[PDB]
Amino acid sequence: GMSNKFLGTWKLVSSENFDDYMKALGVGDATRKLGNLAKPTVIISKKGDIITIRTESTFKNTEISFKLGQEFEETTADNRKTKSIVTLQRGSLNQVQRWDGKETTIKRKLVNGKMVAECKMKGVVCTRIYEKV
Ligand SMILES: CCCCCCCCCCCCCCCC(=O)O
Ligand SMILES: [Cl-]
């Protein structure tokens, strides 16, 4: 299953192309301004086969609990009501969000101890790097 190296508290240290990714989601100007200034902490925890990913930031908090491969209702930070699935592909934790005929992916993988989150929407790719704290 998911590597236990995912479990723990993660702090954003780098974000690239987040503004254009938010635009792709349809996020308004003022919201993106605070979204680009946020330095969220991500906590990944596990209770049995239920994985929990909590994101904490001054602006917004989110939390999703899921089992690999099983669709679930999700509310994103920008307040999208999506049906989402998390899968494992070569150790990569890949989350797909679907809503209003749209689709975006957030792929999380471990690289030299860092967690690297690739966010894709249409032809827009955003990379966010976290470090274990
Ligand atoms: C939680 C801070 C950002 C809040 C601003 C809302 C803009 C919508 C962005 C929602 C998708 C976030 C993708 C980041 C994924 C991650 O790095 O874990
Ligand atoms: Cl923050």
Swiss-Prot record:
Single GO term (MF): fatty acid binding
Binding-site residues for (9Z)-octadecenoate, renumbered to this chain: R108, R128, I129, Y130
Location(s), subcellular: Cytoplasm
Keyword Methyltransferase on entry: no
A biological process term (GO) from this entry: fatty acid transport
Described function: May play a role in lipid transport protein in Schwann cells. May bind cholesterol.
PANTHER family the UniProt entry points to: FATTY ACID BINDING PROTEIN
Full protein name: Myelin P2 protein
